[PDB]
Design a protein around this ligand. Sequence first.
Ligand code: CA
Ligand code: CA
Ligand code: CA
Lengths: 8, 695
Amino acid sequence: XXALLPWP
Amino acid sequence: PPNNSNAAEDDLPTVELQGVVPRGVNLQEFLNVTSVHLFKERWDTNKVDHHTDKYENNKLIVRRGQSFYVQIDFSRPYDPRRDLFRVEYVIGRYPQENKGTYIPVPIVSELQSGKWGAKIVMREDRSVRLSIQSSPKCIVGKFRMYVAVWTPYGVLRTSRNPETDTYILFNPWCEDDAVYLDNEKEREEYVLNDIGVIFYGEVNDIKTRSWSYGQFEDGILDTCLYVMDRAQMDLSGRGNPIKVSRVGSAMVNAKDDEGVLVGSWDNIYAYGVPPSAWTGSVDILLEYRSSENPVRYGQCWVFAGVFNTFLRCLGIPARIVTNYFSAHDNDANLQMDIFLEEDGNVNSKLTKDSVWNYHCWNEAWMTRPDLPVGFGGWQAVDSTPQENSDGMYRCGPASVQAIKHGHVCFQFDAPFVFAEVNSDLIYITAKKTHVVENVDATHIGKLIVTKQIGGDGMMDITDTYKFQEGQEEERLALETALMYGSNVDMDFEVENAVLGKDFKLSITFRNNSHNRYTITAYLSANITFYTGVPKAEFKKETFDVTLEPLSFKKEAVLIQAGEYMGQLLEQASLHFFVTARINETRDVLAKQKSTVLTIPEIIIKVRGTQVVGSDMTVIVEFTNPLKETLRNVWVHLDGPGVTRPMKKMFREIRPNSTVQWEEVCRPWVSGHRKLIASMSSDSLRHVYGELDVQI
Ligand SMILES: [Ca+2]
Ligand SMILES: [Ca+2]
Ligand SMILES: [Ca+2]
């Protein structure tokens, strides 16, 4: 569910 | 040794003889208890009036600082001339009166505000009905009850009786309680609602997950007490919702302390329940209690769901908030350090900080006597392990109001929570020397939401955590936060602030340097309850000023009566934040201060016998509190049973001068009536006086 996103 | 377990108990003597009591003493002369009634049924007035009728527990449950009825049946009628007894509440294995864990409850003529006591309110035959009042600062937990009869030989005490064990919880309904919440709809949602909704997903595709908090289910209250015992939390601190919430933030996660839930994000979840399979807190908590070991597995919303159960169950109002694009700062500098290789790609090895699609934590409602006034209210608490705080995975309570203005120096863990909602992204090139390449000021904390009152809808609460992106205050508060982590002095004073009138906020800058500076600043003026809970911001301004060298500069900000008068309440104070940046040096000057408005008195007195049907003279007295002449003063007198409403006008009242108005009234409703006086003039307005009268 929660996940780390890549930097924009 | 530490008295840190509610479950443990000492053995109180039933025949507590003192000294060398002669054989053949006859204790028959003294009262003994034949029966104790707690009127503890879920339909009866104790549980109904204490808002504890929903628990699936058959023991008496009450909330602290509020009275409840019990009945004691004695062997013969209690006779105050010859008999003396007290009720006792006792908690833990090592109770001590000076710790709050042995509580003697004297039988008194009249209950006293804030004090433990029991009043006899009815006597029939051998029984006495008592109204027992607990302290609003009482330890929260499960107490053993005893009745102790005093004799020349020592105390005669009732035997251990599990059936009279009494739970005392936090009381959001009691105005003297640290968790007091003055709004019934909010108390119903944040204490009594045992289901909720937790928002997740993406900012533009918002998903909703239902969640059963189940705080009233059989076993849950007991498990919450067990959680504190498992923490080895000293009993003496369990009446403090700052401590209880901080303990809860550690204990709901398994790290450090064998707490409730084991976090996992590995998409496999070996030998447990996947985090997304849970739909509520009850199974998790009951399994923790029964296995006496951590439960596998959870992620942020599951930690938040269980923590919410824990809070509401104990009676601390609580809600779950979701932050989209939630920053995780790993090196406590309140920014996202993104190290970029020379190729331009992100160095995954050096970059430690991270950003989550969303993260969920809790807010708990409480005063903060440990912080200056203004910082009570919602406190961020987070049981999801991310960073250590003083040696353990825990987080909060952090005042959301402190976070908003960047005053992250105020405990606990405010800098981390600030970075979660508003850290900048700093793109850095590490070279073989470190070069900053770009700054993203708006990525983090795009939206913060919680369940609405009264429905399953979303409430946007981003503004409670941070000023709006692109506003100057958002930058000034961030720079303040970074500061707490030029030879210019800044102070401010609120000058002669009288309730009902305009007043000046005076901000002073002293430039002791030989440089000219430019200042960019903001002011935030707020109403705060007397207990230090914030109510509302009533004025916010940004301004620029130029500071000449070797000079002092005052900036007068007018605060008009119309800006605050609509939002005042009894004994409210005013809370001001001034934050200024010296532009050339980037230096930040930040102060916060609170002030009490001077309150002009109106005095009401009565002359003549106050009997419905005959004349009485009401004397309303008003003294001009200003150094200025009041003009066109209207005084009003109101008294729903006592007087038809009346007015007197004074064209002019000179400075510091007193006026009196005599009004003859004839009451038409006997008993406890009331007189209310009001004064409004051209400058000073809506000042009141009052007097309870007995007709
Ligand atoms: Ca833990
Ligand atoms: Ca960082
Ligand atoms: Ca920002």
